[PDB]
Design a protein around this ligand. Structure first.
Ligand SMILES: CCCCCCCCOCCOCCOCCOCCO
Ligand SMILES: CCCCCCCCOCCOCCOCCOCCO
Ligand SMILES: CCCCCCCCOCCOCCOCCOCCO
Ligand SMILES: CCCCCCCCOCCOCCOCCOCCO
Ligand SMILES: CCCCCCCCOCCOCCOCCOCCO
Ligand SMILES: CCCCCCCCOCCOCCOCCOCCO
Ligand SMILES: CCCCCCCCOCCOCCOCCOCCO
Ligand SMILES: CCCCCCCCOCCOCCOCCOCCO
Ligand SMILES: CCCCCCCCOCCOCCOCCOCCO
Ligand SMILES: [Mg+2]
Ligand SMILES: [Mg+2]
Ligand SMILES: [Mg+2]
Lengths: 289, 289, 289
């Protein structure tokens, strides 16, 4: 069986003083198409394969291509994936919950380098022999994630640096806890990163959370992000503040709102301020199909 | 929801004396696949996104890629589109009705340069930050079209030339009228083009029309195309004659036929003569799927 | 109508002493997606078009693109195809029946150069004006195949070498016979190749066959491959031995097994030895969707 799903998004993206001779405000848009092939068996084992075709405004050649394939095998809550995998640091819950605006971005996200699912081709040739293995296991409320990425699997393993990651999250109706740790993140020797987060659903309407990160060799040093969101009917209000250890850094912060226009249609906007005083703002729509 | 549609076409394409060491007759073919994502809402607003994958014989690398995305929002007869848009000069009725043969071509088409929907990627890098906005409005019989194309939206607007186009068509059962005007067509300063056309359905079987163009900075100068077509059951006969103001130009003319083999299957052929005495002929099939 | 089908495969691929500084064992995988457009008519003539998107581990840019299109017209057992066609030497029965392992490979396959369906783009530019015509005709048990490939159809025909191929196979319940002949195979002047094969189904469980080849200008010279396979319920055991005329060559041989885990899911493995003493082994899964 083959299924297709995806989303389109478009709107305005403002970056205060983007560059000499550059427009501060542009129309930023993205089209994402996922192609999923699945083979269900009567033994209860599912085999799947996925390809992504994603286009972003500004992409080279004004064209769209597919990325590198991902394969998986699923059985009784256990999923083993091979190829262009989702990694543990990128898959755990809570780590991206300060996201806001129609481009779902946040200075409050971890400021470190690590591997993640590659949505597109890479013209440098760097990902040509990149291969990962990932294992996920889900119990009721517990999620365990394991990932191993070899950036160049054809070369002897002792000559290249592999990324190894582990992560777990747990949640009940009101409290959520999550943690992750990855050694040699991004294939960088000694870039060891970690995350610990917690969130409290202090109503059926609000949430407040706190994420803490060790960003390894990144110049940001350790980081803390405090975020919260509140739903008023169809409109959701979001905010966050984040601090890094880098000497002289500013406190980053953002404020935004989402409006659920219809099932699958979300109008979003945000005003954010970065660690180096960058001012960014956006307003747009995302529609899922 | 995601839908796929398209067409295939193949046949013979003859160009008298194509070139030294070249075959005059070749097998010319095209595969076109459109990927359309749509999100319908109960408020009556539809969101859509589209991608095209088109291959033509002779294409570089013997491969097919997707183009740059188009997004739209529709409500009550009004459609706003963003990204790789259809422009007003290319969308108006009548302007392409002298087309003939299985490759749907005609020397009688406007001899000017202007932007249009980009079916493919562009290896030059020229379309990388190209972005358009288009608005269409349809009443019963009236169609209004507006388009604005910025060839490089990241650069300050006063440093680049934007194309602005406007067009409208109207029709009842027998008479059709259409007009268009575009300033700085194709991003060329002072390339201002215009079109005015009219067609008369002098039966339920025949049509005769006349298109007039101002081709802006093109060397062709003003142009007039007179065309007609007549249906005899499943077979349609077509002809046209066209004249440009260029000094020394020949009258262009063409004669062709279509045969509707089945719903979605059209066999077509044409013999055409250009403004510089070029002789072209074709015969092939188009099938829609 | 547009349909999508394909397969995914992944597993281990071992090549004894692959290279200095290289890993002998790698994770080898392939994703194949076929896009088929078809137009059925009430006259009984079907028109079709096909595109393929295939990714293999190690592919340049860690991306996937479509190949060059194939078009066909079918009526009463006769199929005419144009464009990126399947050729007669590659389409006949029996010639690939010594295949084994999850990568379906065999040293026992013909050691010659010839054109075949191109699954992917070609960055060299070599296939840009490549065009084929192929005609197949199937009676009850008889299959006839004809193919003509022009590697650069834009250039005068007397300046380029075209491949012409013919093939036929016949089978009843127990005996199968097949033969093929191709002149200027692969666009190489005087590379004339041939094949003759026969297979005997000596049960409802086993098969033994013998393929013979004339490999034209290849250094392998003539070749003989003897293969057999036996089904034990869901598990199939396969073997082959092959000899070439090249001076000093070793006898190639392979042994493998398939396990039909479920409809559309096949687990396969093989250990093979080549004509130059190469030792290859594989183990993996293929799943069809
Ligand atoms: C009006 C044509 C010339 C001006 C071009 C500058 C472009 C600014 O126009 C904004 C028109 O809006 C379209 C873009 O998508 C973002 C809109 O907001 C999203 C939905 O809430
Ligand atoms: C095989 C799938 C198609 C992907 C191949 C595209 C290869 C293009 O690059 C060829 C070499 O030139 C380098 C391109 O510049 C970088 C492009 O991507 C950056 C995103 O905007
Ligand atoms: C300057 C060029 C255009 C860029 C402007 C985009 C700015 C869009 O607005 C930012 C979104 O901020 C809204 C605030 O959150 C407050 C609450 O009320 C909203 C829910 O109804
Ligand atoms: C016959 C093989 C060698 C000659 C090759 C030259 C190619 C000319 O052959 C034309 C065969 O036709 C196939 C092409 O599609 C166009 C046919 O007309 C379209 C349907 O009315
Ligand atoms: C990202 C989608 C794939 C499109 C990228 C293809 C990029 C190929 O070009 C890389 C640089 O070399 C230039 C190619 O020559 C022109 C090709 O297209 C002309 C149509 O025949
Ligand atoms: C010289 C190489 C092959 C190229 C030949 C293609 C020429 C095909 O014919 C052109 C089509 O012209 C047909 C004429 O219109 C007349 C009416 O009767 C047709 C409807 O039944
Ligand atoms: C365990 C992580 C580190 C070791 C990486 C070396 C990779 C070898 O691991 C093999 C794990 O298997 C996944 C690959 O697909 C092939 C398995 O066999 C196919 C099904 O019968
Ligand atoms: C138009 C469809 C996209 C295919 C175009 C990709 C073009 C990439 O090449 C641009 C020039 O550089 C040469 C690439 O190196 C060879 C790649 O393929 C070999 C398979 O691993
Ligand atoms: C050395 C690294 C890993 C590579 C090992 C792949 C080797 C896999 O095994 C080869 C398959 O050979 C099996 C034999 O046929 C014998 C019969 O019994 C099998 C059916 O149940
Ligand atoms: Mg963008
Ligand atoms: Mg062509
Ligand atoms: Mg491989």
């Amino acid at each position: 069986m083959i299924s297709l799903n995806g989303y389109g998004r478009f709107g305005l993206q403002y970056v205060e003083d983007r560059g000499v001779g550059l427009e501060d405000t542009i129309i930023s848009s993205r089209l994402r198409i996922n192609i999923v092939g699945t083979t269900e068996t009567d033994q209860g084992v599912t085999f799947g394969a996925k390809l992504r075709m994603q286009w972003d405004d500004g992409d080279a050649f004004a064209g769209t291509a597919g990325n590198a394939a991902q394969f998986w095998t699923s059985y009784n809550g256990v999923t083993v994936s091979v190829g262009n995998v989702d990694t543990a640091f990128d898959s755990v819950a809570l780590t991206y919950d300060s996201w806001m605006g129609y481009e779902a971005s946040s200075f409050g996200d971890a400021q470190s380098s690590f591997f993640w699912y590659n949505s597109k081709y890479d013209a440098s040739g760097a990902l040509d022999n990149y291969n990962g293995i990932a294992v996920t296991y889900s119990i009721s409320g517990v999620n365990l994630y394991l990932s191993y990425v070899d950036p160049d699997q054809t070369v002897d393993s002792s000559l290249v640096t592999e990324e190894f990651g582990i992560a777990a999250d747990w949640s009940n109706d009101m409290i959520s806890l999550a943690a992750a740790y990855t050694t040699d993140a991004g294939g960088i020797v000694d870039n060891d990163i970690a995350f610990v987060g917690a969130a409290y659903k202090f109503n059926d309407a609000g949430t407040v959370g706190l994420n803490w990160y060790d960003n390894g060799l990144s110049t940001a040093g350790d980081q803390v992000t405090l975020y919260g969101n509140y739903a008023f009917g169809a409109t959701t209000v979001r905010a966050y503040v984040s601090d890094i250890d880098r000497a002289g850094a500013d406190t980053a912060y953002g404020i935004g709102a989402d409006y659920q226009f219809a099932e699958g249609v979300k109008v979003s906007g945000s005003v954010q301020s970065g660690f180096a005083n960058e001012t960014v703002a956006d307003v747009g729509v995302r529609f899922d199909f």
